Amino acid sequence: VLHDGFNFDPAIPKADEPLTITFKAPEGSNFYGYADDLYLHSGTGANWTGAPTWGDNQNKYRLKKTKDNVWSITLSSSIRHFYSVAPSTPLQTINLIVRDAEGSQQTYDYATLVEDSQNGFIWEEPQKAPLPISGEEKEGIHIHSATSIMLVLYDKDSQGGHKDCVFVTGNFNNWKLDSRYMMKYDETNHCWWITLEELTAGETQFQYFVYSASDGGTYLCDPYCEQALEKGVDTNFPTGAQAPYVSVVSTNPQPYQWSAGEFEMKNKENPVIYELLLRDFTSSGNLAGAMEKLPYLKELGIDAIELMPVQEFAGNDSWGYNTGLYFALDASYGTQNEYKAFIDACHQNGIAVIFDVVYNHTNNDNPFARMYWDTFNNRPSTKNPWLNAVTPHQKYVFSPDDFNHTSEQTKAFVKRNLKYLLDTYHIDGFRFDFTKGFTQKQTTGDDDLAATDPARVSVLKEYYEAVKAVKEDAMVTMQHFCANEETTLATEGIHFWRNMNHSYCQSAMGWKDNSDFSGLYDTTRPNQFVGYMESHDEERCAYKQIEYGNGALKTNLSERLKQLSSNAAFFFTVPGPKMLWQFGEMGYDISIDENGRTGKKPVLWEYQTERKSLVDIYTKLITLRTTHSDLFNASSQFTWKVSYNDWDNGRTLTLKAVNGKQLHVYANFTNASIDYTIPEGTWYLYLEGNPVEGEKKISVPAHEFRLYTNFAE
């Protein structure tokens, strides 16, 4: 009798006996009805000792077809002799891939356990025992003492099944599988657990080996670790450990001393948000480099820094939209305490901190993925309780590992992670990446995906309410781009990205086509829409000038900075929260496609002095929202003429406070001077408080604006 996949004679592989491996292709699978022989790509232990060169078709690697959909191979003399393993090396796992002769079609990483009598690895029945703790955050790493930690690993698949055993391996047992480090299973709580005793204080490194007869075994780290080494990044990644991740825990942490107490976001109803990628914001690409620039951002007058994703992402050179671990921040930007110090410094400068967080998808490195994996199709198992096997929204497939947001396990994980980041890092709110992806509906395009999904609306409220329960003044922004759902969710106090990049690129270039600014201001709830001329996802307004500008806007820096300054006068002057992408204030004009869309960008701090005239305008316009905040109250009456038809005679905006304060802006986006009659009144050129007669007529040069207040300071 044969199960689907790999079968073993002897049933329990023995390191020092021969082994017959029989592979049975399951129905639908890619070798189902395959006619020819298959080949074995295999090796022992974490790093596949003795693996051949991919495609080596020596007879010793041939699996003979013995029946329909059944192939067999014998590892002769012994397993140890087959892989040339030394007699005193514990041989505890065998990793198996079957492939065609061409090395084109294949199965994916699988392992089984090997008993090594000769070296003292004898199998034992795993014990059942009750979890000795209770409560809502049972899973993960509990520091019991300087010398002991309890590990708790959730294990229940979507078919109600679980693994057969779990070993903990690490620096404490030289990365071996050992019967003393077998976790006990609690069937009521659906958790493996163990206490590691007799650790030396300092740093414990570990991973799990999880095993079932039906799934085989796999190495994975703890999803709740706060610190991880990643193989290919950390030079000290342990030799005995398998890629990708090793969990790190200190039983004696040096705990960060937070300054003073109580931080509140300034201008909290309508903040100016600076979107920052640590990788490209400074030459050092890290927190320490960014910390040197907090004085610059404070003077700029911003209310909040939005950090592009800092949760552990694949490798160390990324935008961050490829999260492998959610409770560990990426050590390429710095240590846990450097993240706290950076956030503390922001706070001490008056600046809030928002984390960009990515819950649509994770990657193949996530323990949640590795726990229940399909080794035939290289994607999450259909039994995976957190992840979809196949992305429901086929228009947008950013990784193989799409979260199921109708899973209770997924929802509990996201809420616990949002609470963790608020409690540990003292952050001020969240920008949720791609909330449109929090859906189980089968779709193939933009319109079917964008149609209302009441379950998507419902889970986004749940996530919002979970954040508010922890910090009632936390700012929750969602990158959604689904109009009907945004109306419902904006009513609850959720903020939404309002993408005005297209219009302000067109105006920056001097093209009136599709230049309508009006989408920046939602007339119903202007404070719920975070409007931007630029984001990390879009082309730079100052780059489009160079590539496609009308006339002098291609070549004349002076004129380009005037036009970008006029854009800003039609942006920071508008009620509701606003976002700028790093260096827009200094006319950053490298194409998004330079060095590839997500590639490292040039770091051009010399632009801060060479385009200081634009930095000054941004600073004054942003600072105006602090010094005259009563003007930008959403109660203020706001009117503007910013359509396709508002061009040859200028664009206008007037903002009128209930207390009688007024702001008026005129701009000429054209390539020629235009005559304008200032509206009636006594006006000051606030960016210069020198008075100006209203009902008076001026010539406004190409690309320039005039800003007027009916107050002098």
Ligand SMILES: OC[C@H]1O[C@H](OC[C@H]2O[C@H](O[C@H]3[C@H](O)[C@@H](O)[C@@H](O[C@H]4[C@H](O)[C@@H](O)[C@@H](O[C@H]5[C@H](O)[C@@H](O)[C@@H](O[C@H]6[C@H](O)[C@@H](O)[C@@H](O)O[C@@H]6CO)O[C@@H]5CO)O[C@@H]4CO)O[C@@H]3CO)[C@H](O)[C@@H](O)[C@@H]2O[C@H]2O[C@H](CO)[C@@H](O)[C@H](O)[C@H]2O)[C@H](O)[C@@H](O)[C@@H]1O
């Ligand atoms: O380490 C390897 C590698 O991994 C990474 O790559 C992952 C991807 O990252 C990036 O994509 C991100 C965005 O940055 C993020 O902001 C977010 O953006 C999504 C939106 O959430 C989603 O809604 C959708 O937007 C659509 C929109 O829905 C639709 O309605 C319309 O909207 C317009 C409208 O048409 C218009 O009228 C106007 O009103 O404005 C609207 C707003 O635009 O069109 C929108 C845009 O199409 O899509 C966007 C993204 O475009 O979420 C994603 C993912 O979290 C990168 O931009 C992307 O290139 C990366 O994918 C790359 O890598 C993948 C595998 O690794 C691969 O599958 C993919 O093909 C490949 O290109 C890291 O971040 C890298 O740094 C790293 O090296």
Ligand SMILES: OC[C@H]1O[C@H](O[C@H]2[C@H](O)[C@@H](O)[C@@H](O[C@H]3[C@H](O)[C@@H](O)[C@@H](O[C@H]4[C@H](O)[C@@H](O)[C@@H](O[C@H]5[C@H](O)[C@@H](O)[C@@H](O)O[C@@H]5CO)O[C@@H]4CO)O[C@@H]3CO)O[C@@H]2CO)[C@H](O)[C@@H](O)[C@@H]1O
């Ligand atoms: O420090 C030791 C060592 O560590 C790292 O390599 C080890 C891996 O971390 C470990 O997983 C294991 O690698 C396995 C691999 O996981 C497994 O999938 C298989 O790899 C096959 C692919 O399956 C197969 O498709 C083919 O891959 C091609 C790929 O198709 C092609 O598109 C292109 O990208 O190149 C690939 C390479 O030929 O072949 C590979 C096998 O080559 O088997 C692997 C084991 O052989 O063990 C690795 C070695 O210990 C580090 O990456 C390595 O530098 C370090 O020396």
Ligand SMILES: OC[C@H]1O[C@H](O[C@H]2[C@H](O)[C@@H](O)[C@@H](O[C@H]3[C@H](O)[C@@H](O)[C@@H](O[C@H]4[C@H](O)[C@@H](O)[C@@H](O[C@H]5[C@H](O)[C@@H](O)[C@@H](O)O[C@@H]5CO)O[C@@H]4CO)O[C@@H]3CO)O[C@@H]2CO)[C@H](O)[C@@H](O)[C@@H]1O
């Ligand atoms: O009346 C005759 C003429 O009128 C119209 O064309 C003129 C436009 O009205 C005018 O604004 C100006 O066009 C600008 C355009 O507004 C501006 O955006 C820029 O266009 C660039 C894009 O910015 C750039 O991204 C790229 O667009 C590509 C895109 O990358 C690609 O993926 C795909 O979508 O195709 C697009 C090209 O179709 O390149 C364009 C440049 O082609 O600069 C434009 C001017 O260079 O000038 C137009 C006349 O030159 C009508 O549109 C036209 O049909 C009539 O013939």
Ligand SMILES: [Ca+2]
């Ligand atoms: Ca990383």
Ligand SMILES: [Mn+2]
């Ligand atoms: Mn999704």
